[PDB]
Design a protein around this nucleic acid. Structure first.
Lengths: 217, 202, 174
RNA sequence: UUGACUCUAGUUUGACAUUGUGAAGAGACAUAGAGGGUGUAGAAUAAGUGGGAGCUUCGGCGCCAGUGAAAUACCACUACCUUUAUAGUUUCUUUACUUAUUCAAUGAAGCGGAGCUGGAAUUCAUUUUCCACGUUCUAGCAUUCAAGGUCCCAUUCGGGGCUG
RNA sequence: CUUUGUAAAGUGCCUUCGAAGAGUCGAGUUGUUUGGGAAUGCAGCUCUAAGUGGGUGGUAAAUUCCAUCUAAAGCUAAAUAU
RNA sequence: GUUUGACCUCAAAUCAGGUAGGAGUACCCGCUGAACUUAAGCAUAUCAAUAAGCGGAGGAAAAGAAACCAACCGGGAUUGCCUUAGUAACGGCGAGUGAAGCGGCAAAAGCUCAAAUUUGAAAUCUGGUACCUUCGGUGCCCGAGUUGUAAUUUGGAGAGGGCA
């Protein structure tokens, strides 16, 4: 009803983000997310689009950083918490079985180059194939400080074999109204590839890495 | 005006309310005569839209025509023709059941003039109509200018000649390419374009 | 019920629409004062009468000017009135289903009225209206939301009542 | 006239409409909430999609060492089996209700329920439930309210209430 | 002769409004009819709407626009037939 | 259980005032409806949406002021003639049937209700009676009618309110 359930979604924010027993008050940013709620649940032998839609608002799945692009980004971003990995390395990295498992299990953010998107897809490529863990195009001598949002905001939409997906909706230190605006945008950019909404509605939830007994669709 | 709420309600015919009322009225009407009178309109908003007024001279008459096709009255179903006209059962009357209902009331109450009929109720073997008639002899109607015209003897048995809403429908009297055969009169149109019109100088 | 009805009709007995005589005399005074003084539409003080006729009071309820609406229970085609309690509630006018359209008709100097409505009242008689509005709101207005749910009828004849009461005492009360 | 060609009244079968209302089995659907899945290494038992570096009053595991496609723990939500306890439609089949419809009959007289009297049921004279309700040897008759009771008729004439 | 009249009509700018017809429209099907051809009208039966709505736009449908009217109520001389 | 009065629906009368049939039918509005015949046969077609049959009017009838035509630089109720045209179309695509728009002309004319709260006044109408200046008028009286009769509005508009 005129910004859907914004009377109970504000309760869903305030009665989670500031709690030390219910939400448990853990270490860091209590990162809020949401699944979907549809009747459009034909398992899609059509092979569902799975389109990587983006928004400039930051969900911030941003703990683990790495680097693949070299010769510029190594000595430009060494100021940041990145750790430089050279060109003769990914051979010895993937030579033992476990190293790549540890890498794509923990390392969830990557920076590449327009010259280092050539030697990428041979070795690492299909070792995971479904982890949703890849770099993105950023230039050699460029901003580097607009990447903190533009890369990790692009989270994934792979919906193969079963209709089980979930696009995260901001975190604690982000804007208060923007997460309740981007959820509506996240429904709109779902019905972009989908046909039905059911109807101007998803199925609301904002588990900030802890989901209490808030039983909303 | 209650008339707008009546008009809107009466359209929802399978609303729990009209469902009940259909069942109880169709019983009341079936128990009375075939062509009996009506003390007032059952649908006072429908009546007045068709031209009924609540002044002396205007009457309503409830009438129930049998449903179904027109069985050809030929004896033993034998037609004495060619196969194309051996039909007996699946044949339809060209006038409507409204027209038949108007026609039989027109014959019953000959002193009055049929203004307009309309649908009230129906079951499987009956359809129920309320004909709005007018008294052309009552001064009430003869003195008012808005209904003076009906008294003129060129409006005697409109329902018979087929000048009522039902008749005009059944005669396809409508403007457009759709009604080319029957616009100015099916018979008039036929004889006009089957007339050989010769001049003095050919 | 027949004591709330009695009191409603005792208030509604006043504000009876002007008679043919009372009208004529008032018109003779007014139309005379149009010559003598030339003071028209100020003479013949404002009338407090009951509002009546279906298409009149429907519009007074739609504009929310009505303070009490009496709805007849025996109108020839019920459809004329089936919508009126539901309209009356939605607009929030106090309404009562009163027994007799004949009783309403006798109150408005017609034969039948099928509806009545008090939209104004004299300052003296506003207290009675306020009380009788609260006692009729207890029955009709308040309980509308519940009565809306529940069906009437489905009631057997007295002979089939007695048969069911026999056939129910057969199995269970054996 | 017929297994000639083409039809048709009739009849019969189905669907729909007239066509309402209940009960015992079922689709649950808005509405819940416990199970509900071990190809793999691995403490061991990962259906999944998105979270993370510390929490918990103490216990317990992530963090990280660690295996593997899925990092557990801490939980949200999506269906993939199951349970039923919402009474939110017939969904299909087995019965029932009157009120539509239908068939009779009477010059629309005695219908239904109850109560008397039963004579009694014995559990025992009852607030318990089974148990009838004025006419028969005879080719007659049976019609205009008679008996008691109560007010009037001022006590003439009688006509009226309830029984019968 | 009056004399309607103190009562009726047209006209301009602003402001809020601006009701407009249901067993109908329409659809299926049967019959008939038309030059009207996946159906021109009419009629029976089943279903049965809507309110930026409905009809029509002479090849059925879906999506997108456009044009044009305003149905299911009604009065009305002459040019025509004889 | 009574007293009286309403209301609603349905009746009765040799009730006050009225009206319907029948005739005619050339032309007009409808319904119903063939076969001969044509096809060199014949069943669809054709004759023919004709004859016969039945219902209903008038001096004309019907129609008619757009749920129209169009696709244009757009026209603008209705009917009739010239034309479109023996054409587009139909059709055992055989026999055969077969419109419409534009264009010129004849005559031209437009309008009415329902859906609105008169609500500071059913303002409306039939009837009866009396009188008069009698295709009617007025006063009074019963009735109709608020389950809506008048004034206002008809889509081209228009209504309420404001100012000039």
């Amino acid at each position: 009803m005129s910004k859907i359930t914004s009377s109970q979604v504000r309760e869903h924010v305030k009665e989670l983000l500031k709690y030390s027993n219910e939400t448990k008050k853990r270490n860091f940013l209590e990162t809020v997310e949401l699944q979907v709620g549809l009747k459009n649940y034909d398992p899609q032998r059509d092979k569902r689009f799975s389109g990587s839609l983006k928004l400039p608002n930051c969900p911030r799945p941003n703990m683990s950083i790495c680097i693949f692009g070299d010769a510029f980004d190594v000595d430009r971003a060494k100021s940041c918490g990145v750790d430089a990995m050279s060109v003769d390395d990914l051979k010895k990295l993937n030579k033992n079985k476990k190293l790549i498992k540890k890498l794509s299990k923990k390392y969830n953010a990557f920076i590449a180059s327009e010259v280092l998107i050539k030697q990428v897809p041979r070795l690492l490529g299909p070792q995971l194939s479904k982890a949703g863990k890849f770099p993105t195009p950023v230039s050699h001598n460029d901003d580097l400080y607009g990447k903190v949002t533009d890369v990790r905001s692009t989270i994934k939409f792979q919906l193969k074999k079963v209709l089980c997906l979930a696009v995260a909706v901001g975190n604690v230190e982000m804007e208060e109204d923007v997460l309740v605006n981007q959820i509506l945008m996240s429904v709109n950019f779902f019905v972009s590839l989908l046909k039905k909404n059911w109807q101007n509605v998803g199925s609301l939830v904002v588990k900030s890495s802890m989901g209490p007994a808030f039983r909303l669709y | 005006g209650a008339y707008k709420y009546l008009e809107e309600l009466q359209r929802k015919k399978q609303s729990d309310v009209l469902r009940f009322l259909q069942r109880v009225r169709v019983w009341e009407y079936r128990q009375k005569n075939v062509i009996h009178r009506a003390a007032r309109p059952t649908r006072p908003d429908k009546a007045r839209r068709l031209g009924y007024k609540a002044k002396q001279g205007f009457v309503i008459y409830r009438v129930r025509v049998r449903r179904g096709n027109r069985k050809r009255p030929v004896p033993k179903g034998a037609t004495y023709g060619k196969p194309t006209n051996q039909g007996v059962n699946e044949l339809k009357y060209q006038r409507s059941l409204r027209a038949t209902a108007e026609e039989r009331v027109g014959r019953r109450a000959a002193n009055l003039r049929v203004l307009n009929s309309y649908w009230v109720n129906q079951d499987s073997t009956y359809k129920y109509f309320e004909v709005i008639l007018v008294d052309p002899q009552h001064k009430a109607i003869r003195r008012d200018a808005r209904y003076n015209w009906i008294c003129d003897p060129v409006h005697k048995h409109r329902e018979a000649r087929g000048l009522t809403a039902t008749g005009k429908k059944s005669r396809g009297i409508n403007k457009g390419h759709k009604f080319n055969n029957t616009k100015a009169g099916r018979r008039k149109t036929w004889k006009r374009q089957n007339t050989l019109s010769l001049w003095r100088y050919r | 019920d027949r004591n709330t009805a009695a009191e409603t009709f005792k208030l509604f007995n006043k504000y009876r629409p002007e008679t043919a005589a009372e009208k004529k005399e008032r018109l003779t005074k007014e139309a005379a004062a149009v010559a003598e003084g030339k003071s028209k539409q100020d003479a013949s003080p404002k009338p407090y009468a009951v509002k009546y006729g279906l298409n009149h009071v429907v519009a007074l309820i739609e504009n929310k000017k009505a303070k009490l609406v009496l709805i007849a229970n025996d109108v020839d085609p019920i459809e004329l009135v089936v919508f009126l309690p539901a309209l009356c509630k939605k607009m929030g006018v106090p309404y009562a289903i009163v027994k007799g359209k004949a009783r309403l008709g006798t109150l408005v100097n017609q034969k039948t009225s099928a509806v009545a409505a008090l939209t104004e009242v004299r300052a003296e008689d506003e207290a009675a209206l306020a009380k009788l509005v609260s006692t009729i709101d207890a029955n009709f207005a308040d309980k509308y939301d519940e009565v809306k749910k529940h069906w009437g009828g489905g009631i057997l004849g007295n002979k089939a009542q007695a048969k069911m009461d026999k056939r129910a005492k057969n199995s269970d009360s054996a």
